[PDB]
Amino acid sequence: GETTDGVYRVMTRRLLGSTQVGVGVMQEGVFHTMWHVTKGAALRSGEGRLDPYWGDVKQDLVSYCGPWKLDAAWDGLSEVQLLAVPPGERAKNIQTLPGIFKTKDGDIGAVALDYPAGTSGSPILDKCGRVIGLYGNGVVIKNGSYVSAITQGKRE
């Protein structure tokens, strides 16, 4: 299979035609995506197989072939870029200043950008190109607009 670092679409042929159900990140030989995209199922890459290695429904994250590798964090001050990979459309960078989700367990950065559900798993990056989390788990606010958490894992 292709193991080059980068952003990848997650596709299925179960439904009509070829459908994009989400997106993920290949880094240091590990594939990273949101749990709701794959439901923890195995994936194919060419003639190769990627087996799940770690996942957690509450974090809404899953890694394949090895442990979660992404550990960069939003600085809480600067603009970031969503590298949106929408279904049937070219990868495109969108720059934005995150808002914040305030929870009983601490604050999380959030991006107010609305893409189709199959864009879930697209990476959010800092100015050094480091992945500070994945887009796709969020909430629908008063006005009906979507706001995603910047969801990041823990590197053991």
Partner: protein, 39 residues
């Protein structure tokens, strides 16, 4: 049967389109990983 296809490199783009607001929201996270607004 799910499969992956490369879509690009992960890089920051100079002069990317800049948009989106920065809302500060009180939220709750449940055991199923669903976020909801707290009011």
């Amino acid at each position: 049967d799910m499969y992956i296809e490369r879509a690009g490199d992960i890089t920051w783009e100079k002069d990317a389109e800049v948009t989106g607001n920065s809302p500060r929201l009180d939220v709750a996270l449940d055991e199923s990983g669903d976020f909801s607004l707290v009011e």
